[PDB]
Design a protein around this ligand. Structure first.
Ligand SMILES: Nc1ccc(F)cc1C(=O)O
Length: 257
């Protein structure tokens, strides 16, 4: 599948990074990093949280933006009222890197989500070492035992897992794994194509934070997700392509007013 191809590339890239920066070294770096921010507290703040994303490109969109200065973009995001900044760090298909994560972490006070394809423990310590407070885990990409393992390790480092699902059954798996935050991706990663959040959201325990991860083109989309019980929404394409990201974020942040 499309997701399979991405994971194959990811596993090779992770292995090459590990050859130059050992697991022992990255574990030490993670342990030495300032503790992660309380992501759950951020997600529980009043109002629909906007998770604004740094993303240069994607399999579905192709090239979106050059983003020569991801730190400056993230600063605009925070200025606009974003709750969390998402930073894509996958290089082959999204043209992101850990350098983007470093830049953003140094530039904003809000929590930072590492958006990548996490398949092994190295990437978790790596995320923490580079200042991530939140880490994406993709149910479609992970066998249940692996998902549970990855989630446990994420939380052991003080980070919050954004557990991404595309189906009700995946939502059920996520809950069983101990997910406290569930994101719904309207895109099928196998093929790149729902009505998803609305179908899936109602079934989640009230205690679990619900995030709509895609399809936000403006306030109307955000409000529709909110009406279906979203606690936050993730927005990338519409922001990275904006000439005025601060204003575009502020518009979404104040949606419904
Ligand atoms: N936006 C995305 C998030 C995850 C993924 F596997 C592919 C895309 C892209 O749009 O095809």
């Amino acid at each position: 599948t499309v997701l399979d191809s991405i994971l194959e590339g990811v596993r090779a890239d992770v292995a090459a990074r590990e050859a130059s920066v050992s697991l022992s070294e990255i574990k030490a770096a993670a342990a030495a990093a300032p503790p992660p921010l309380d992501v759950m507290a951020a997600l529980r703040e009043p109002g629909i949280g906007v998770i604004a994303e740094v993303k240069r490109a994607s399999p579905s969109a192709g090239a979106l933006a050059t983003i020569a200065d991801p730190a400056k973009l993230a600063q605009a995001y925070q200025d606009g009222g974003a709750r969390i900044v998402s930073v894509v760090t996958e290089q082959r298909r999204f043209q992101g890197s850990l350098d983007d994560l470093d830049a953003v972490r140094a530039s904003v006070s809000i929590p930072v989500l590492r958006k990548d394809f996490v398949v092994q423990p190295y990437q978790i310590h790596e995320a923490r070492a580079h200042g991530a407070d939140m880490l994406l885990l993709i149910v479609a990409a992970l066998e249940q035992s692996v998902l549970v393992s990855m989630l446990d390790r994420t939380e052991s480092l003080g980070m919050t897992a954004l557990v991404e699902v595309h189906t009700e059954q995946e939502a059920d798996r996520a809950l069983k794994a101990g997910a406290k935050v569930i994101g719904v991706n309207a895109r099928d990663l196998m093929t790149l194509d729902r009505d998803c959040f609305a179908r899936i959201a109602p079934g989640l325990p009230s205690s679990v934070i619900r995030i709509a991860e895609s399809g936000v083109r403006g306030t109307a989309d955000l409000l529709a997700y909110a009406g279906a019980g979203a606690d936050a929404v993730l927005v990338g394409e519409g922001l990275v392509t904006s000439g005025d990201p601060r204003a575009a974020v502020a518009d979404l942040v104040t949606a419904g007013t």
